[PDB]
Design a protein around this ligand. Structure first.
Ligand SMILES: *[C@@H]1O[C@H](CO)[C@@H](O)[C@H](O)[C@H]1NC(C)=O
Ligand SMILES: *[C@@H]1O[C@H](CO)[C@@H](O)[C@H](O)[C@H]1NC(C)=O
Ligand SMILES: *[C@@H]1O[C@H](CO)[C@@H](O)[C@H](O)[C@H]1NC(C)=O
Ligand SMILES: *[C@@H]1O[C@H](CO)[C@@H](O)[C@H](O)[C@H]1NC(C)=O
Ligand SMILES: *[C@@H]1O[C@H](CO)[C@@H](O)[C@H](O)[C@H]1NC(C)=O
Ligand SMILES: *[C@@H]1O[C@H](CO)[C@@H](O)[C@H](O)[C@H]1NC(C)=O
Lengths: 473, 469, 98, 47, 50
C-alpha cells in the first residue's frame, strides 16, 4: 500500500515543500499510500551516485524528481541517478533538465522531463519567421549532441516549407580565432544570423563581432536562452532579441506540478492488473518490470488541465507540449518583453521593437551585391580568347561595318595543362556572349567577373577515389 | 600494465587465466608486466559493479577492463560511462552491453566495442541488395528512436549513388495498435522488397497483421536489422521463412579468441603510447576522495586508437569507437526455423554470398507460386554475346539481365563457380519486351554442357537435353 | 550504341582546339560536336566540310541556380533580344562570313 | 527562313508545382527520340 | 480478372481477395446489410477513395 517517492535535493525547504505537496495530493486523491524520502547532493561524482543508488533501490521508489543543477551553475548533470534507476527501468521525471543528452529515447528508456528542452527554440524560429516574413537563415551552432539534434529538427521542420538553409557553420569548442566563419557569413547576400552555442562560444563570437561590421545595421541576432545570462549580457550588443520561458525557474512550482502529475499516476497504477511488488533488496534481483512500458503508455495517454503553469501535455519525447514562449528584447542592456507565443497565437506587446541598427524599421535579408561571377568555357566560335597587350589593356578592332568590337577583361589560366602551374593571369576574351552580357548590364545593373574553366571540360559525374561518390566537374 | 578481464559464469577460472596468459606467450613480447585477475559472479548490480571496479583499480592498478557478460540487459554498456569519464581507463567488451552499441556521448569516454556500428549496417544492407540485383526499395520506418538517422543516411547514399536505384516513396508508420490507419499507410506498396525498423514485439505484431492482410506472399522480400533478431534461439511463429537479416554472431569466433584480440589491441596501444612518451599514467589512488580537478593532462589513448593493428588484421576504431572492419555475419531464416550463415563481410569490407535464392515454401499452405520460370540460353555471339564486367561497383550497366554462368576451376576438380557476367543480345531484348506483356519475372540460367544436342544412345544433351528432363 | 565506347574511351581528346588540329592532320577520320560550331569552323577555315543530318537537336541555355531570383528578369531580356531583332543582328554579324 | 523563333510549348498556370515534373519528362522525351519517331506520324511533306 | 467474394464476417480472407484491385470502377452484388458492412470495412481498408 505504501508507495515511496524519492528526490535528490539540497535545501531542506525543498524537502519540506515536497512533503507538503505529497500530503496535499493524498488529501486531494482514501488510505495513506505515499511516503516521502529525500537525499542530499554531494560534491563527489561516483561516491554520490553509489550512495543515492544504495539509498534508493533499497527503498522501493517508483518516481524520481531531481533538479538538473545542484548549484546555481555547475556541470553536475543528473546522469548518474537516472542511470542507476535504469537498472530496473524506473520512470524518472526531470525537474529542470534541459540538455539534449536526455532528449533521445534510444539511450534513455524511462527518463522524462517536466520542462521543455532547447529543441523548442528551433521550432520557435518558424513562429518568428512567419511573423517577420523572412526566407533566409544562417546557422551558427557549435558541435555537440544538442547542436546535432537542433540541426536535425530544424532541417526536418524546414524541408516541408520549400525553403533550404543557405550555409551551415560549425563552432569547435575551445577555438578563439574563428574570424574565417564570420568573413564567410559577411560574404553572403543574406544577413539573418541564428546562433546557438555555449557561453564561452557566444563571448568569443561577440568579441570578434564587436570589431567586425556584424552588428552595425541590416542584421538580426536571434539567440537562445544560454546567451541571455552570464558574460553574454555584459558583452552583448543592444537590439538582440532573446528568448525566455515563463514560470520555468520556480523550483517550488516545478515540484508542485510534478507532484500533481504523479498524483493521478499513483491512483491509475492500481487500476491495471498484473502488478508486481517493488524490489526491496538491491542484491538478489535482476528482473525487469512487466509494467515498465505500461507506465510510459499511461503517462502519455494521460491529460492534465491543472497546475501552476497550466495545461500539461506529453509528446512522443516525453516533455511538455505547446509551451509558452517570451521574447526578451535587449534595449540599452535591459530586458524588454515584446512577444508572447502560446504555440499558435501571436501576442506582441505595444512597445516598439528596437533593432540593433539605427533605423527602427524591420531589416531586409536581401542584399544583392550584384557581383555575379560568370565562367565561360573556351569555345573558338563563341568566345575569341587572345592574350592581352603588355601595356595594361586590350587592343580594339573593328568589323566589316566599322563598328567597334566591345570586349571585357577576362581572368583565367594560361598553360591550361596538367602538372603545370596555372597562374591566374588576366586575358582578353570576347565573342557572342559578351554582347549578351553587355545587353544584360544595360537592362539591369550587373557587374561581371569573367572567369575561365579550371580544367577545360564542361564537367560530368565523377566516380573516383572511393567506392561511390558523385561530384560535378 | 596489469589488465583485468571480467566474464560471466563459464568454465573454471584457471583455464581462462591460462588462456589470457597465453597471449603474450605466443608473440608480442613486451617488457611491461601483464597481470590478469579474472572474476566470476552471477550478480550484475550497479553498486556491486562500482565496488568491484574500485577494488580492481585500487589493487595492482589495473589499466584496462573488459566486461564480457552474458546478461541481456542493455544498460550494461551505459553503466561504465562514469568509470570511463572519471578513471580514464580503456573500456572493452564482448557480449551483453557491448554486443550492441548505440550510445553516443562526449569523447571523454573510453568506450570501444566490437559490435556492429548502427550506421555501418545500412552499407551491408544495401550492398547485399546490389549483389542480389534488386535496385527497387521500400523504406518503412517507425517512430522508434534511432531511425531518422537511418532515413537520412539512406537518402544521402542514394542521392550520391550513380547506380540508379529506383527509390520508391517511403512509408513512415506512426505507431502500432491502430488497426485502421496501418492498412491505409501500407496499401501503397508496389515493390518486392520491404524494410522493417521496429522492435521485436512490434515486428511480430506487424507480421501477424500482414499475415491476414496478405503481405506475406512468396514474392515479397523482407530485410530485418540486428535489433529485432538479437539472440538466435527464440523464433516466433510469426516470422516467415526466407527472411534476410544481418547481425554480429559468434558462430566461428569464440569468446576466448575475442579476449585475446582485445588483449593484443591493448598491448599494441600501450606500445604506441610508449613511443611518444616514457611513462604509463595512473588513475586516482582512492575511490572516495576528490582532492583535485579530474582533468586529462596525460594525453590518454583516445586519439591513438586509429594506428593499432594486431595479428596482421586492421582492427581500428573511429572517433565514435565504431569498428572499422566488423564481421557482419548474414543469417537467413530457413524453413526449419533456424539461422544459417550466408555472407561474410570481413575481407576488405567486401561481402560474398552462397547464392541461394529459393527460400519461399510453406508459408500459408496456399498459393503455390511458380512464376520463377528458368530461362536457358546458348552462347551465340552473333545473337547472344556475353562478356566480363568492368569494375565500377555495378552489375548491370543499363538494362541487361544478370547472366549467371557456371565456371569450372581447372581440368581436375568439378565445381560450378557462380560468377555474374554482363550479357547483351537480341533474345535478351525479346525477353524484356515479352516480360512487360506477360507480367512475370524470368531469371536467366546459362548452361555449358553441350552446344545444341544429339542422340548418343538415346541420351539428350545441350539445351534441349537440359529442358527435356 | 555501346560499340562506340569501345573506341571513344581510348581516342577522345580534351579540347576542341586540339581536336580540330588532330582532324586536320588526318589523325581523326570523324568528329561529333554541335552543328553551329562545325558550320562556323567550315565557314572560317576552308579545309573541312560538314555532312549528314542533325541528330539530338537540343538548344543552348543559361545556367542558373534554384534559389537565384534572376529568372524572370533574364527570361524577359532573352525574349526582348529574340523579338526585337537583336538575335538577328548578332547572327548577321557572326554568321555567313563568306 | 525563320525570324523571331520563340518556339512555343506546353503552358502552365502561375504557382503550379507541376512544372518541375513536366519539364523533365518533356526533355527526356525529346532527348530519347520520341519526337523523332513521332515526327513521321504527322510532319509529312514533299521535298 | 473478376474477384468472387465467398461470404462476409471473415475479416481474414476478404482483404486477401480484395488486395488485387487495380482499376477505378468496382461493382457490388450483395444485400443492403452486406453492402453496408463491406463499405464500412473498406472505409478502414482505404478502398473508399475519391
Ligand atoms: C518512508 O520510508 C523511509 C525509508 O524506508 C522510512 O524510514 C520512513 O519511516 C517511511 N515513512 C513512514 C511514514 O513510514
Ligand atoms: C586569425 O587568423 C587570421 C588568418 O588565419 C589572421 O589574419 C588574424 O589576424 C587572426 N586573428 C587573431 C586574433 O589571431
Ligand atoms: C568595419 O568596421 C570598422 C571599425 O571597426 C570600420 O573602420 C570599417 O569602415 C568597417 N567596414 C565597412 C565595410 O563598413
Ligand atoms: C513561482 O512559480 C510561479 C509559477 O506557478 C511563478 O509565477 C512565480 O514567479 C515563481 N516565483 C518566483 C519567486 O520565482
Ligand atoms: C542602377 O544604379 C543606379 C545608381 O546606383 C540607380 O540609379 C539605378 O536605379 C540602378 N538600376 C536599377 C534597375 O535599379
Ligand atoms: C528585376 O529586378 C528584381 C531582381 O530580379 C526583381 O525582383 C524585379 O521584379 C524585376 N523587375 C521586374 C519589372 O520584374
Amino acid at each position: 500500500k505504501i508507495v515511496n517517492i524519492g528526490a535528490v535535493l539540497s535545501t531542506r525547504k525543498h524537502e519540506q515543500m515536497f512533503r507538503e505537496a505529497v500530503n496535499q495530493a493524498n488529501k486531494r486523491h482514501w488510505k495513506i499510500q505515499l511516503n516521502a524520502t529525500s537525499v542530499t547532493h554531494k560534491p563527489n561524482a561516483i561516491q554520490m551516485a553509489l550512495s543515492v543508488c544504495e539509498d534508493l533501490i533499497s527503498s522501493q521508489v517508483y518516481a524520481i524528481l531531481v533538479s538538473h543543477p545542484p548549484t546555481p551553475n555547475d556541470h553536475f548533470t543528473p546522469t548518474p541517478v537516472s542511470y542507476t534507476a535504469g537498472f530496473y527501468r524506473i520512470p524518472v521525471l526531470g525537474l529542470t533538465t534541459r540538455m539534449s543528452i536526455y532528449s533521445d529515447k534510444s539511450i534513455h528508456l524511462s527518463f522524462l522531463r517536466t520542462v521543455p528542452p532547447y529543441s523548442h527554440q528551433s521550432s520557435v524560429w518558424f513562429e518568428m519567421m512567419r511573423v517577420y516574413s523572412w526566407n533566409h537563415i544562417i546557422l551558427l551552432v557549435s558541435d555537440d549532441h544538442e547542436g546535432r539534434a537542433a540541426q536535425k529538427r530544424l532541417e526536418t521542420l524546414l524541408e516541408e516549407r520549400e525553403s533550404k538553409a543557405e550555409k551551415v557553420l560549425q563552432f569547435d569548442p575551445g577555438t578563439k580565432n574563428v574570424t574565417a566563419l564570420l568573413m564567410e557569413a559577411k560574404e553572403l547576400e543574406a544577413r539573418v544570423i541564428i546562433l546557438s552555442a555555449s557561453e564561452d562560444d557566444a563571448a568569443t563570437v561577440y568579441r570578434a563581432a564587436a570589431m567586425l561590421n556584424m552588428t552595425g545595421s541590416g542584421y538580426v541576432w536571434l539567440v537562445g536562452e544560454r546567451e541571455i545570462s552570464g558574460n553574454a549580457l555584459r558583452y552583448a550588443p543592444d537590439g538582440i532579441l532573446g528568448l525566455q520561458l515563463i514560470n520555468g525557474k520556480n523550483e517550488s512550482a516545478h515540484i508542485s506540478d510534478a507532484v500533481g502529475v504523479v498524483a493521478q499516476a499513483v491512483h491509475e497504477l492500481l487500476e491495471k492488473e498484473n502488478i508486481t511488488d517493488p524490489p526491496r533488496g538491491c542484491v538478489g534481483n535482476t528482473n525487469i518490470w512487466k509494467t515498465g512500458p505500461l507506465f510510459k503508455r499511461v503517462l502519455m495517454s494521460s491529460k492534465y488541465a491543472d497546475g501552476v503553469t497550466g495545461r500539461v501535455e506529453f509528446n512522443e519525447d516525453g516533455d511538455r507540449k505547446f509551451a509558452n514562449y517570451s521574447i526578451m528584447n535587449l534595449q540599452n542592456r535591459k530586458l524588454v518583453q515584446v512577444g508572447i507565443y502560446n504555440g499558435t497565437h501571436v501576442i506582441p506587446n505595444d512597445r516598439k521593437i528596437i533593432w540593433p541598427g539605427g533605423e527602427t524599421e524591420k531589416p531586409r535579408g536581401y542584399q544583392m551585391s550584384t557581383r555575379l561571377k560568370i565562367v565561360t568555357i573556351h569555345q573558338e566560335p563563341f568566345v575569341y580568347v587572345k592574350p592581352t597587350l603588355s601595356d595594361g589593356t586590350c587592343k580594339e578592332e573593328f568589323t566589316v561595318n566599322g563598328d567597334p568590337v566591345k570586349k571585357v577583361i577576362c581572368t583565367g589560366p594560361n598553360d591550361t595543362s596538367p602538372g603545370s602551374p596555372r597562374h591566374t593571369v588576366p586575358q582578353c576574351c570576347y565573342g557572342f556572349c559578351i554582347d549578351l552580357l553587355i545587353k544584360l548590364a544595360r537592362t539591369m545593373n550587373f557587374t561581371y567577373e569573367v572567369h575561365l574553366v579550371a580544367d577545360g571540360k564542361f564537367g560530368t559525374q565523377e566516380r573516383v577515389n572511393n567506392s561511390n561518390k558523385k561530384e560535378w566537374n | 600494465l596489469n589488465i583485468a578481464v571480467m566474464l560471466g559464469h563459464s568454465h573454471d577460472v584457471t583455464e581462462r587465466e591460462l588462456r589470457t596468459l597465453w597471449g603474450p606467450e605466443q608473440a608480442a613480447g613486451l617488457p611491461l608486466d601483464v597481470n590478469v585477475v579474472a572474476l566470476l559472479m552471477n550478480r550484475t548490480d550497479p553498486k556491486s559493479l562500482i565496488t568491484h571496479v574500485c577494488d580492481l583499480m585500487s589493487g595492482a592498478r589495473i589499466h584496462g577492463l573488459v566486461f564480457g557478460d552474458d546478461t541481456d540487459q542493455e544498460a550494461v554498456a551505459q553503466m561504465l560511462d562514469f568509470i570511463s569519464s572519471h578513471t580514464f581507463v580503456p573500456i572493452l567488451g564482448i557480449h551483453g552491453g557491448a554486443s550492441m552499441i548505440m550510445a553516443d556521448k562526449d569523447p571523454t569516454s573510453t568506450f570501444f566495442q566490437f559490435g556492429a556500428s548502427i550506421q555501418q549496417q545500412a552499407t551491408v544492407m544495401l550492398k547485399i541488395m546490389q549483389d542480389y540485383d534488386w535496385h527497387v526499395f521500400s523504406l518503412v520506418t517507425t517512430i522508434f528512436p534511432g531511425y531518422r538517422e537511418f532515413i537520412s543516411f539512406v537518402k544521402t547514399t542514394v542521392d550520391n549513388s550513380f547506380v540508379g536505384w529506383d527509390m520508391q516513396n517511403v512509408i513512415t508508420l506512426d505507431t502500432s495498435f491502430e488497426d485502421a490507419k496501418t492498412q491505409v499507410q501500407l496499401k501503397k506498396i508496389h515493390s518486392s522488397v520491404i524494410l522493417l525498423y521496429c522492435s521485436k514485439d512490434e515486428a511480430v505484431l506487424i507480421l501477424s497483421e500482414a499475415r491476414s492482410l496478405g503481405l506475406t506472399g512468396y514474392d515479397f522480400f523482407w530485410i530485418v536489422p540486428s535489433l529485432v533478431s538479437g539472440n538466435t534461439e527464440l523464433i516466433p511463429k510469426e516470422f516467415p521463412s526466407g527472411l534476410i537479416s544481418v547481425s554480429y554472431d559468434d558462430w566461428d569466433y569464440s569468446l576466448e579468441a575475442r579476449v585475446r584480440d582485445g588483449i593484443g589491441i591493448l598491448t599494441t596501444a600501450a606500445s604506441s603510447m610508449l613511443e611518444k612518451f616514457s611513462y604509463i599514467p595512473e588513475a586516482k589512488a582512492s575511490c572516495y576522495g576528490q582532492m583535485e580537478r579530474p582533468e586529462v593532462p596525460m594525453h590518454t589513448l583516445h586519439p591513438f586508437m586509429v594506428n593499432v593493428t594486431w595479428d596482421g588484421k586492421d582492427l581500428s576504431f573511429t572517433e565514435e569507437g565504431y569498428q572499422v572492419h566488423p564481421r557482419l555475419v548474414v543469417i537467413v531464416l530457413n524453413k526449419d526455423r533456424e539461422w544459417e550463415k550466408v555472407g561474410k563481410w570481413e575481407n576488405h569490407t567486401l561481402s560474398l554470398r552462397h547464392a541461394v535464392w529459393p527460400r519461399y515454401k510453406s508459408f500459408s499452405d496456399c498459393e503455390p507460386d511458380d512464376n520463377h520460370l528458368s530461362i536457358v540460353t546458348l552462347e551465340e555471339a552473333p545473337f547472344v554475346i556475353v562478356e566480363d564486367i568492368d569494375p565500377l561497383t555495378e552489375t548491370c550497366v543499363r538494362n541487361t539481365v544478370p547472366c549467371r554462368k557456371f565456371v569450372k576451376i581447372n581440368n581436375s576438380t568439378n565445381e560450378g563457380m557462380n560468377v555474374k557476367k554482363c550479357c547483351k543480345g537480341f533474345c535478351i531484348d525479346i525477353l524484356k519486351k515479352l516480360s512487360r506483356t506477360v507480367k512475370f519475372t524470368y531469371d536467366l540460367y546459362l548452361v555449358t554442357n553441350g552446344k545444341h544436342g544429339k542422340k548418343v544412345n538415346n541420351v539428350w544433351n545441350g539445351m534441349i537435353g537440359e529442358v527435356v528432363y | 550504341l555501346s560499340t562506340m565506347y569501345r573506341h571513344m574511351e581510348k581516342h577522345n581528346y580534351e579540347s576542341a582546339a586540339e581536336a580540330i588540329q588532330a582532324v586536320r592532320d588526318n589523325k581523326l577520320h570523324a568528329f561529333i560536336w554541335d552543328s553551329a560550331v562545325l558550320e562556323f569552323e567550315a565557314s572560317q577555315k576552308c579545309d573541312l566540310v560538314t555532312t549528314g543530318e542533325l541528330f539530338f537537336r537540343s538548344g543552348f541555355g543559361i545556367g542558373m541556380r534554384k534559389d537565384s531570383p534572376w529568372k524572370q528578369n533574364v527570361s524577359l531580356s532573352i525574349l526582348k533580344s529574340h523579338e526585337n531583332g537583336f538575335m538577328e543582328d548578332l547572327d548577321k554579324t557572326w554568321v555567313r562570313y563568306q | 527562313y525563320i525570324f523571331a523563333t520563340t518556339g512555343y510549348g506546353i503552358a502552365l498556370q502561375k504557382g503550379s508545382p507541376w512544372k518541375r515534373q513536366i519539364d523533365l519528362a518533356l526533355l527526356q522525351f525529346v532527348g530519347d527520340g520520341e519526337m523523332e519517331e513521332l515526327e513521321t506520324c504527322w510532319l509529312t511533306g514533299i521535298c
